[PDB]
Write a protein that binds this ligand. Structure first.
Ligand code: NPO
Ligand code: NPO
Ligand code: NPO
Ligand code: NPO
Ligand code: NPO
Ligand code: NPO
Ligand code: NPO
Ligand code: NPO
Ligand code: NPO
Ligand code: NPO
Ligand code: NPO
Ligand code: 6NA
Ligand code: 6NA
Ligand code: 6NA
Ligand code: 6NA
Ligand code: 6NA
Lengths: 309, 309, 309, 310
């Protein structure tokens, strides 16, 4: 029996008791709606912020919707956080990760820009990546419409968003935006293919994210397993920016995040590796249902502050 | 053509111009004196503190000399830093690392207890470990002579002291002292055998610590390559305490520290890996000759404060 | 405050940062190794020469080790330099003054024979003098092992070696060797007792040679203050050979050197008195750490060439 | 005693003794001055041939001071300039008595030499000579157009009274700098400390060229107060003395005065070369034909000057 916190185990028991249907079983509208409902019920409420503003920027296939969060209406030049939500590149949007974005903006006292990237299966790989990249470049250019000047960007994201974080840092590393990536924060990222990993076999069912969902997401997104924009473990780590990798000890894709932090050490890159003990995948968005997960996010915040100086 | 900082390059040029003998070509006391002079002449002066006191604790061979450093005349229960110097378990002493110890005490605002462990070749392996373990367990016991109640210990050390840091944390992990290891800070540690590593071949000559010096230390200390008290990469990493591993990009034993941080990630343990760019082995003790290394030490201190809360 | 050169001040600041134990707090082997390490790091490297050879000569206690230095593989009859190292008659050896000897041989284009005389406290006064005298008389005899005929001898030495320089020149003046002393070069010598001098009070601490070291050397050597072989100011100056006296403006024993040159003028003898401005005792052996001291040694060399005609 | 005397030196002294000529007191000033001109004219080596031997003059405190420039070179780089003050007790000597010595110093140093025709006692008593030596040295140190070469520094030099003037000038320029520093001073058998009461004056009072009788005669004419450091520069502040070469003679009645000065410089931590020429007298610099070994003594002073400058 792997270690599980009591608060985390009750939540898994409640999900099992509630016994909802799989992503395969639901329409795309219902599956998307169930993800909204899960974070709506499970996450702490949104922080009150001076700024919660819809924006958009030009993208390779039309405008990309954005949402700006800032505890301040007016601020000095500084790093800007560019956030990419999880959901296998199929589900989630600006609302599923809204409260988490308000928490990051409140606790860091930095602006956060969340990206409403194109979703599969309607828009398969590499749509999401291209929009995450374009939106990050746009923020990094300190456009008038952002309302604050960016000295640097901080890519951050959960799960598929952690994948996007790593891919965007690699793309801006090869072709710089107007300011550097000063820190990346991949949270339970997919970096290496989870297929064949010990974590995926150990946590395949009953740990919030399932092997069933992972196969559902894989079929929708259609990323080539040889493409570094799909599986960024395959990219060049020799100039990776300062990194914080956070994983969960019960995550089926835990070993994917281990793999990435090991590759950064192997390449001589600075990295904070935090493996949250006795919690699952999604821990950043279940901070009311599993209250100890607020402490986990706060450890990531403390690491981010240290790594920015 | 590896990256070298200008101040670091000037220092390596001065050493090369000196063209001194190898440690093995010197008498044993001339080898010890050469390291006293290197650190004495290259390091920043001691910080002024309220408390710098010589004391001793029982060990398996007899008394183990200790030095207490504290910026405060008196303090309540808190973590106590237990420091083990470098020098291949052959050279160094309480004076070679005294200034660095005052700086750790000043910047952390925690008490530091430095250990004058027994040296090889007079006291081969595992004498240094026995003494570092006994002194750390003694500090952890909150003895009245120290006047500083320990809620926790923080093993820290450079090079051989980084080796001792990891071994001590393993031994206390397996048979606890009166309080836990709350953080360990191996700085350019020997964890895996450096023989056959790419870093040892790249940086064998001209980077402060040499392959000749490593061979000299190995002949004197006589650690069995199969004994986890000699090569702690062989130890059980599954319950390792929170860790900061700091390396130098030009260190012949750099890959040993990369190996250890990678082993902690592989085991799901929390770790900060910092690889200082364009500096050598010994960067903690050359902070006057190579002024940019002060900022390197300050990064370790910032990581320590984050990982303690 | 007294005038100090910026390069000299930077070296005194490094010694103050080091804050070593005193010579008396160390073992004899440690005290000796500390001097090796000081000159090893502080002096310019050895010049390359055609001849650097170890030999020995008979003395009153047994064989005296010698080292011959010569820029030329073969040379005709000429003066030979007979060098005696400093170190209070307690520390120093053929290696501590080696580089300086290679420099004197390179810049003078004359052969140099350094004397490894017996040291206190194991061999108290007048052991050092007996050996320096026997070696100088031996060199003056043009022995076939030397491979170079002496037309004359040039005693030279620093500190205790400058004491020995003067004593040896007095002993050979009273009972000639096979060839005369044609020039003597006492460098920061002890001629008159430093105890009670104004320079000893002014420069007792922080100017390389300390009053504590002087007292340490006095206790080991045990020269009687009435014996002219310990305090050669007490000797007969009426037939002193041509002399160069070099002192340092910051030397605790500076006034001893002033006293000797004054005694030579009083007796009508030819003397060059050079007092190096803004440097300490040991300036001859710190020519890498304090680069301006190379020019001080070159002034002594120019005076030597002028006085040899 | 029987002090050591070189055979050539002793031959010169015995020839002077055989002449049994009058004292400075038994002669008129004009006779004393012409007698010294004749002595040096026979006893010194001849003038070296130089590119430049030129009369110049500079303003002084009591009117124009006559000077003579000696240079081996018509045109030279900026460098030190030697400022020379002749001996003769501040009563006798002139530009001509020390002319050949000047040409020799210019030829062997390959530096320009400016000799000062300072005002003589008893017509111009102390401090006239000193005020003229100081004015001329300051004028040379200003690198005036009329000098024809740039001074980077000055080198006071002089024999006997002129060694006295050398030290006093160095002290005056030390307290109130000229446009360039004194880079070296070369007092040759100087009067620094009062010779009265010295062991050398008693030993060498008669028969060694300079006599106690002549010393009394000069003292009477010059009238310097024994407490005035411009008269007796042993009394001045040595703490910032420039690099010095003190040359004395072993048979000089004022030898001990020169010893006293070189000792005071060592006592003050100043760089000094002390050369005491063995078996020769006072005025060895100007008897170099009568006593050929004295050429070697001058050449040692030259070698010391090159070492102390270079
Ligand atoms: O993608 N995800 O992280 C998921 C997917 C399904 C679910 O029920 C919870 C989380
Ligand atoms: O959503 N996710 O975290 C995923 C989705 C697909 C996959 O292959 C691995 C992880
Ligand atoms: O969620 N994700 O990060 C994914 C999903 C599918 C895939 O092929 C690669 C990555
Ligand atoms: O052990 N060390 O770190 C060393 C050893 C030798 C040396 O010259 C410098 C540093
Ligand atoms: O310095 N060290 O850490 C060492 C030295 C020798 C050895 O065999 C193992 C480790
Ligand atoms: O001093 N050191 O860090 C060492 C000593 C020995 C060795 O095998 C490796 C490293
Ligand atoms: O004798 N000496 O020159 C010394 C002795 C000791 C020391 O630390 C420095 C110089
Ligand atoms: O080593 N030294 O230069 C010394 C040693 C002893 C003493 O009394 C004076 C000077
Ligand atoms: O170093 N020295 O020259 C010395 C040392 C001791 C002493 O009594 C006299 C002279
Ligand atoms: O001419 N001289 O050299 C003299 C003249 C007078 C005197 O008191 C001493 C020396
Ligand atoms: O010739 N001199 O140098 C003299 C002459 C007289 C005197 O009072 C002082 C010095
Ligand atoms: C097999 C995977 C379960 C967790 C074991 C580990 O921490 O590597
Ligand atoms: C060959 C080892 C030197 C540096 C290459 C690296 O960072 O892995
Ligand atoms: C008190 C001793 C220090 C130096 C003063 C001098 O040069 O005589
Ligand atoms: C200048 C004419 C000579 C006068 C000399 C004298 O008064 O003795
Ligand atoms: C005053 C007697 C002359 C010679 C003695 C000496 O050289 O001091």
């Amino acid at each position: 029996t792997p270690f599980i916190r009591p608060d985390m185990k009750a939540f898994l028991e409640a999900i099992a008791a509630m016994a909802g249907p799989t992503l395969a079983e639901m329409t795309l509208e219902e599956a998307r709606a169930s993800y909204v409902a899960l974070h709506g019920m499970a996450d702490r409420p949104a922080r009150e912020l001076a700024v919660i503003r819809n924006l958009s920027c030009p993208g390779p296939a039309g405008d990309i919707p954005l949402r700006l969060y800032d505890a301040r209406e007016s601020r000095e030049a500084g790093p800007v956080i560019t956030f990419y939500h999880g959901g296998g590149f199929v589900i989630g949007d600006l609302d599923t990760h809204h409260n988490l974005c308000t928490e990051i903006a409140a606790l860091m006292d930095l602006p956060v820009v969340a990206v409403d990237y194109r979703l599969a299966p309607e828009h398969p790989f590499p749509a999401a990546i291209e929009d995450c990249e374009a939106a990050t470049r746009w923020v990094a250019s300190s456009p008038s419409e952002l309302g604050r000047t960016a000295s640097g960007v901080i890519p951050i994201g959960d799960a598929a968003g952690g994948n996007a974080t790593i891919v965007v840092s690699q793309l801006l590393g090869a072709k710089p935006a107007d300011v550097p990536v000063v820190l990346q924060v991949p949270i339970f990222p997919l970096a290496s293919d989870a297929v064949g990993s010990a974590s995926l076999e150990a946590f395949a069912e009953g740990f919030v994210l399932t092997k069933a969902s992972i196969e559902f997401f894989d079929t929708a997104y259609k990323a080539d397993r040889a493409d570094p924009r799909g599986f960024p473990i395959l990219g060049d780590h020799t100039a990776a920016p300062p990194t914080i990798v956070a994983t969960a000890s019960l995550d089926p894709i835990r070993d994917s995040g281990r793999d990435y932090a090991k590759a950064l050490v192997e390449a001589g890159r600075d990295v904070v590796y935090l493996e949250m003990e006795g919690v699952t995948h999604s821990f950043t968005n279940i901070r009311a249902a599993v209250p100890s997960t607020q402490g986990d996010l706060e450890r990531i915040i403390a690491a981010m502050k240290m790594m920015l100086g």
